[PDB]
Amino acid sequence: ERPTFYRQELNKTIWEVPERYQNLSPVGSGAYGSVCAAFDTKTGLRVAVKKLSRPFQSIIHAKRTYRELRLLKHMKHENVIGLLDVFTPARSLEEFNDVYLVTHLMGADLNNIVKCQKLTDDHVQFLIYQILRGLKYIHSADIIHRDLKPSNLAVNEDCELKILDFGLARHTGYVATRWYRAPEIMLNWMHYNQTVDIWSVGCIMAELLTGRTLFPGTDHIDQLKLILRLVGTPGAELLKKISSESARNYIQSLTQMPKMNFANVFIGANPLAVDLLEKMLVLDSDKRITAAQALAHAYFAQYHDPDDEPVADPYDQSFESRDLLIDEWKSLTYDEVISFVPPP
Numbered sequence: 484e485r486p487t488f489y490r491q492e493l494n495k496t497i498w499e500v501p502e503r504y505q506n507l508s509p510v511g512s513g514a515y516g517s518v519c520a521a522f523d524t525k526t527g528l529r530v531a532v533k534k535l536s537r538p539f540q541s542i543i544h545a546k547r548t549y550r551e552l553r554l555l556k557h558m559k560h561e562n563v564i565g566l567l568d569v570f571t572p573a574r575s576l577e578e579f580n581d582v583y584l585v586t587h588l589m590g591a592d593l594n595n596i597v598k599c600q601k602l603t604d605d606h607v608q609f610l611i612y613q614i615l616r617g618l619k620y621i622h623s624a625d626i627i628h629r630d631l632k633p634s635n636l637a638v639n640e641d642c643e644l645k646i647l648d649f650g651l652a653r654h655t656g657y658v659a660t661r662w663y664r665a666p667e668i669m670l671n672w673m674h675y676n677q678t679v680d681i682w683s684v685g686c687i688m689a690e691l692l693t694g695r696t697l698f699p700g701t702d703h704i705d706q707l708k709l710i711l712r713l714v715g716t717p718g719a720e721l722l723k724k725i726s727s728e729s730a731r732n733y734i735q736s737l738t739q740m741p742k743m744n745f746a747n748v749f750i751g752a753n754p755l756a757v758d759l760l761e762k763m764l765v766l767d768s769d770k771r772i773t774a775a776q777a778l779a780h781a782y783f784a785q786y787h788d789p790d791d792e793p794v795a796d797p798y799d800q801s802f803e804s805r806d807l808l809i810d811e812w813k814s815l816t817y818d819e820v821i822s823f824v825p826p827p
């Protein structure tokens with residue numbers, strides 16, 4: 484049975500939602516959509532609702548819409564956002580033009596937790612453990628997040644964490660994606676692997692330990708300069724792996740920089756935290772630690788449980804290779820909306 488919908492304007496966006504979702508309030512807004520917090524009067528819990536902006540306006544938007552809904556419908560893990568509800572006011576494919584996605588509202592993002600709580604080393608252990616646990620699951624579905632940063636980590640007052648991706652394309656509480664980006668993806672060095680996300684985790688962990696952005700570059704050139712000042716310039720073995728000629732010629736043109744000893748950078752940190760950082764912030768991603776390996780690191784001895792670090796069910800990404808028209812991406816999305824089944 485179709486719920487009763489109501490309409491409401493909030494910060495210039497028109498929201499049309501089932502009456503179960505009330506007290507809508509803004510969380511974030513950018514070119515691709517907006518997110519509000521609300522109260523779900525069915526369950527008595529707070530939820531976040533994402534409305535895609537004109538999701539079938541172009542091929543790239545239609546495919547993004549479908550990708551997000553496919554992925555959110557698949558994610559079933561404690562440390563990753565999951566889909567509580569997906570709805571449209573439209574009563575048929577013909578009038579389907581808006582998609583809304585619903586998840587459990589977490590207290591805050593990882594930035595706001597730093598303002599509120601004083602993160603001891605135990606807190607850092609627990610928070611990074613959960614990121615890696617969620618990343619192991621995500622990577623096991625052959626998915627790379629690519630956008631990990633503190634604003635994409637949702638945290639409650641109990642310091643329980645979930646990975647999400649706002650996906651709104653915001654630019655200047657601003658947190659730049661580039662500050663957490665591995666150099667090999669930022670500069671298109673080579674066909675990169677899943678451990679670009681581990682680079683991001685290292686940057687986040689560093690910031691949780693020190694209170695400051697590890698590499699706050701103002702553009703990609705300054706970003707790389709800041710990175711190489713810590714980890715040193717690529718040596719011969721890694722340069723040869725930079726298969727982009729333009730990228731390699733640029734790196735080879737820079738003044739060589741020595742690698743720093745992280746024990747002298749992260750003064751007073753748990754030695755095991757320093758050791759993990761040294762394994763995540765490896766320039767050569769063939770040598771960078773994976774999420775599964777990092778979960779086994781002695782830094783996480785208090786939390787690590789190999790029988791409770793689950794992997795994902797097989798995720799069918801054959802849609803990624805298809806070249807479809809807007810109306811075809813729209814119809815596949817509509818199918819996925821209609822087939823959704825709430826979790827129990």
Ligand SMILES: Cc1ccc(-n2nc(C(C)(C)C)cc2NC(=O)NCc2cc(F)ccc2Oc2ccc3c(cnn3CCO)c2)cc1
Binds near residue numbers: 510518533592637648
């Ligand atoms: C084209 C594209 C775009 C994105 C993705 N993508 N990829 C992932 C992976 C699996 C890779 C991590 C996740 C997603 N997408 C989202 O995470 N979409 C956000 C979302 C979805 C909802 F259904 C409802 C609200 C949403 O936004 C929020 C915002 C803040 C929130 C919550 C909760 N707490 N808090 C903190 C404040 O209290 C939720 C894939 C493709």
